[PDB]
Structure formats: C-alpha cells, structure tokens
C-alpha cells in the first residue's frame, strides 16, 4: 500500500486536511491507509472513513446517472446511431465505481466488521456494507444482481437487528441506518410499502424518545428525522 510508510496519526491528520480542502479522493486514500494499520477505528475515525468514500462514490453515482440517461436516450426510436462511445464511457465510470465499492467492502471484510464488538461500531460498519452493496446493485444488470441485492439486504438486516436491541430509537446511527434501509426497499427491492412503513415507524418511535435527550443530541436526532419525513413526503 502506498500509505504503508506513513504513521497512522499522520494519515488521520491528513485525512482531516483533505476534507477541509474538499480533496475526497485523497481523504479516502488516507483513511484506507489508516484502516490497513490494523487497529480498530474510533468514532471520529469511522466518520472520516465514511465521509471520504461517500463523497467519492457519490460523485461516481451522479456521473453514472448522467451517462446512463444519455445511453437510454440513444436507444429510443428515431435516435441517430452514434457508435459505442456512450456505452464505453458509461462502462468506464461503472467499472471505477464498482472498484471503489469493492475497496470499501474489502476494508469492512478485512477486518473491520469482525473486530467490531460494540453496537455503535458494528452497526455503523454493517450499515456501510449494506450501502456499498446497494451502490453495486444500482448498476447491476447480470447473473449476480439478485445475490448483490440480497447481500445489501442481509447486511442492513443484521445492523437493524443489533440497533433495535442495543441502541435507543433516537440514536443517529440507528436512524441513518433505517433511513438508508428504507431507501433500499423503495429504490432497489421494489418494496415501496416496506420503505414507507419503515420510515414512518422509525420517525414515530424516535419522536417518542426525544424527551430523554440533551439539546445537542436532540439537534442530531431531529436532523435525521427530518430526512425520514422528507422521503415520506416524496413517496406519499
């Protein structure tokens, strides 16, 4: 690994600098190096890792969607043939995206998940596993599409089961997991009713537990609750 010679602490410091500079490819590379040191990640460090890869893959997903749209339009009646270029370039972006997903999934499997015993860490990583399988599912069209979808479902389900047992209904990790699993149901699993049920039940159970919270925890929880409401509004 190109980061093998750099101190763990220096990699974390640089990941923070890269975030300030909006250099998310750099940030992800730094965080990958930090994970490969083999020590567990603190909460702050887990969030650096997630921010970096979310921003890299987010950009790739947006580009993929632009290119897929152009490709779809090229295959409509009356569209002039323009050769293989659109498909080729969509494939290029797709392959890069799959590579990033495989990299993240690799870090999780070697060996973040297996060393994560606390609910907060384990749920966080399992949510990530679901998320990156979901990104793979978005672009999957072949023999393995069902298995990819099932891998996302399985990771999310394990995370949900732990979160319900071990975390309060206002915990931001529990909320963001439910938010994203709900989107999985709506966008990937062709289960809009499940998506809506999950988002509603999550919102309502969080609402009932807000009274237990400090001002700052209330801020954190209500932010994600609003995202649940935003999706419900989009879907109903």
């Amino acid at each position: 690994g190109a980061m093998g010679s750099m101190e763990r602490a220096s990699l974390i410091q640089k990941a923070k600098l890269a975030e300030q500079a909006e250099r998310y490819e750099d940030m992800a590379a730094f965080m990958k190096g930090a994970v490969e040191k083999g020590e567990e990640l603190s909460c702050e460090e887990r969030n650096l890792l997630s921010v970096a890869y979310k921003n890299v893959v987010g950009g790739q997903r947006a580009a993929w969607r632009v290119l897929s749209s152009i490709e779809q339009k090229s295959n409509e009646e009356g569209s002039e043939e323009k050769g293989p270029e659109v498909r080729e370039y969509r494939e290029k972006v797709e392959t890069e995206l799959q590579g990033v997903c495989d990299t993240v999934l690799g870090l999780l499997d070697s060996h973040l998940i297996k060393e994560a015993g606390d609910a907060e860490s384990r749920v966080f990583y399992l949510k990530m596993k679901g998320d990156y399988y979901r990104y793979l599912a978005e672009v999957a069209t072949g023999d393995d599409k069902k298995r990819i979808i099932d891998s996302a479902r399985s990771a999310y389900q394990e995370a949900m089961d732990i979160s319900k047992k071990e975390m309060p209904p206002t915990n931001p990790i529990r909320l963001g997991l439910a938010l994203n699993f709900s989107v999985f149901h709506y966008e990937i699993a062709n289960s809009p009713e499940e998506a809506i049920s999950l988002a509603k039940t999550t919102f309502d159970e969080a609402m009932a537990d807000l009274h237990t919270l400090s001002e700052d925890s209330y801020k954190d929880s209500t932010l994600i609750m609003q995202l649940l409401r935003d999706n419900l509004t989009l879907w109903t």
């Binding site: 998320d131 963001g176 938010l179 994203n180 989107v183 709506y186 966008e187 994600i224 995202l227 935003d230 999706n231 989009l234 879907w235």
Partner: peptide, 5 residues
C-alpha cells in the same frame, strides 16, 4: 432522489 446518510 431520496435522502440517505
């Protein structure tokens, strides 16, 4: 597109 975190 729906919100995720």
């Amino acid at each position: 597109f729906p919100a995720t975190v």
